[PDB]
Write a protein that binds this ligand. Structure first.
Ligand SMILES: CCCCCCSC[C@H](NC(=O)CC[C@H]([NH3+])C(=O)O)C(=O)NCC(=O)O
Ligand SMILES: CCCCCCSC[C@H](NC(=O)CC[C@H]([NH3+])C(=O)O)C(=O)NCC(=O)O
Lengths: 222, 222
């Protein structure tokens, strides 16, 4: 509710988008406190002294940091709402694994596109994203088993872990002039991304690619 | 059994030690298959094709990769045994956060001492480990609340997440000549470490410092 739950956030952040989507799924009302480029709110400094990063969930004045730890907490606390993590332990392990792979391997390689110097090191980095996308496409096929989401009939953990990145992937496409996810290259993921973005829990916190692209260059600021 | 549970590991690995300790806590018997430097077993290649890393837990021919995911899996599957994660959602979010801290910041920072070239960029790195350790000492105090472990009366998630590194910490002290965890700089951690290494789930899978230091030598395949 607006009282007991605050989210420290910033609308362009994929990591923060993970928390908002998960709160929506649970039908948890909350207060959204937005950070600004170039400064830190006193409440952030207080709540996340170790990392000073967003998102931070503040529940009855108790802070929870790190997006995936926050998703887990919302799922373990509001455990009577719709399940975010899969029911079965083995399936939970698979889902955690692929979320960890996205933060460790995939998203860093996405950013390494806007970071490569030379038209060789760029194309090499493009090949790495495409390849990891093929892994992700196959994973979705094996996990979803004909159902709309990674988590089956309903958006789950992995949906949220990967889906949060859709805005920045679409931005990365336009600026690199490379399409990564579409009907032709990744037919299952393309169908999945349509469902995910139109889901009610997602629809209103997933930013238009147009806005996000412009903030992307507002972040042209060394 | 020694049949139904296989662990692909290697005795010098602190990440493998995580899985071994958790299995012992649950009293789960398992087969231990050891990797060797410069090779990958066929069974590892088919079980962790994405990362080709150990540990890998194979449960009834089903592979689970990544040490903290493995620990979660063991705690969630053998859910009638002694609990590894805390019971409370908030405490569990805090125990996850510090384990995540250790793998993101502390441990690479520990390794960045050995890899530091130039007497003083080394000093910078040495100060980073001591800063990090003061944080963990204070965290141990606030979290144990006078109990012997991070986990209370019994060893817990965070005990395992951190203590798995004790052997390599010692090696790092030996080689760098610096004293990091001890009665003067980290009094509580110093007593805890002795308690931890004494635990039955721990004492047989934690390698002797000198043995480990010699393997660190053999780790001269450049
Ligand atoms: C900036 C928006 C777009 C760039 C992508 C990063 S999103 C926001 C970013 N958040 C983080 O890096 C925290 C990640 C954290 N490991 C988590 O998963 O929760 C941030 O600004 N954290 C504060 C900081 O980096 O200091
Ligand atoms: C060797 C002891 C020094 C400690 C660092 C490396 S331990 C062994 C190393 N394991 C990992 O990197 C596991 C990382 C994984 N995140 C996990 O937590 O399990 C490995 O796979 N080794 C084989 C490989 O990476 O190819």
């Amino acid at each position: 509710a607006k009282s007991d739950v605050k989210l420290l956030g910033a609308w362009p952040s994929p990591y923060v988008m993970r928390a908002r989507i998960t709160l929506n799924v649970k039908s948890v009302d909350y207060e959204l406190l937005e950070e600004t480029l170039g400064s830190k709110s006193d409440l952030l400094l207080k709540s996340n002294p170790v990392h000073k990063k967003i998102p931070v969930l503040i529940h009855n004045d108790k802070p929870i940091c790190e997006s995936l730890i926050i998703v887990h907490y919302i799922d373990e606390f509001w455990s009577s709402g719709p399940s975010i993590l899969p029911s079965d332990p083995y399936d939970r392990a698979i889902a955690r694994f692929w979320a960890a792979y996205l933060d460790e391997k995939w998203y860093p390689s996405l950013k390494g596109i806007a970071s490569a110097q030379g038209e060789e090191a760029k194309k090499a980095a493009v090949d790495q994203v495409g390849e990891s996308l093929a892994l992700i496409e196959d994973t979705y096929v094996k996990l979803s088993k004909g159902k709309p989401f990674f988590g089956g009939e309903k958006i789950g953990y992995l949906d949220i872990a990967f889906g949060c990145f859709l805005g920045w992937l679409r931005v990365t496409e336009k600026t690199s002039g490379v399409k990564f996810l579409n009907e032709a290259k990744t037919p299952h993921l393309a169908k999945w991304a349509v469902r995910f973005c139109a889901d009610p829990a997602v629809k209103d916190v997933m930013p238009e690619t147009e806005k996000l692209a412009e903030f992307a260059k507002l972040l042209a600021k060394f």
